[PDB]
Amino acid sequence: SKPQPIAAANWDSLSELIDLFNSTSINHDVQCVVASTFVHLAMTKERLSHPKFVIAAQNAGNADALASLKDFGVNWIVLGHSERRWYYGETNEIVADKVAAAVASGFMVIACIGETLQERESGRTAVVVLTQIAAIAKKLKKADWAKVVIAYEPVWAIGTGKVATPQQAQEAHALIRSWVSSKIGADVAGELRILYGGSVNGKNARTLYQQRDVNGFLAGLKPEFVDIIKATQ
Secondary structure (H helix, E strand, C coil): CCCCCEEEEECCCHHHHHHHHHCCCCCCCCEEEEECCHHHHHHHHHHCCCCCEEEEEECCCCHHHHHHHHHCCCCEEEECCHHHHHCCCCCHHHHHHHHHHHHHCCCEEEEEECCCHHHHHCCCHHHHHHHHHHHHHHCCCHHHHHHEEEEECCHHHCCCCCCCCHHHHHHHHHHHHHHHHHHCCHHHHHHCCEEECCCCCHHHHHHHHCCCCCCEEEEECCCCHHHHHHCCC
């Protein structure tokens, strides 16, 4: 069976969004995450009170900064999101180092991996994606995977004019899990949450979630997020 799903939203009125989240009864077991930028942190922190939600930082790579976040009550962090890699120049190793640092600092880490349009088109989804997570694994020890969540981000589907079928997402998630099973252990692979991190709405989320290897979502901080949460069953 599947591990606990996660519905995570990455940073519309934020205040109104939080109101909506706070008011949302979530009946099933699902860990909800709102990843904020530094500036919106204290506000999200004081406003978001739904106990099935946790707040996540993003991209912190400094030990002191990590320590401060943890002190501020932030225990989750999103790392490796597409733009960090394709725009900011965070290499597989830099992301890996951040993941390892965050884990060492007591964080739950949502580590994003994903291939570009050109990589997918040229048939290199597997080598790109697995190389990215292999870099992450190299800096972790087995026990650390308890603190790791992988988000698969079809970068290739973002502003490229391409769509992500349940089959495509399942294929990607399955190959990641198979690599984790082989290289890290089947016990780890069994517990590992692999989130689909491409643009998703209520309907397609519910369908995606039905796939064997999909354990939830990394999506937009938008009112539709409530539907993404409900989709995780």
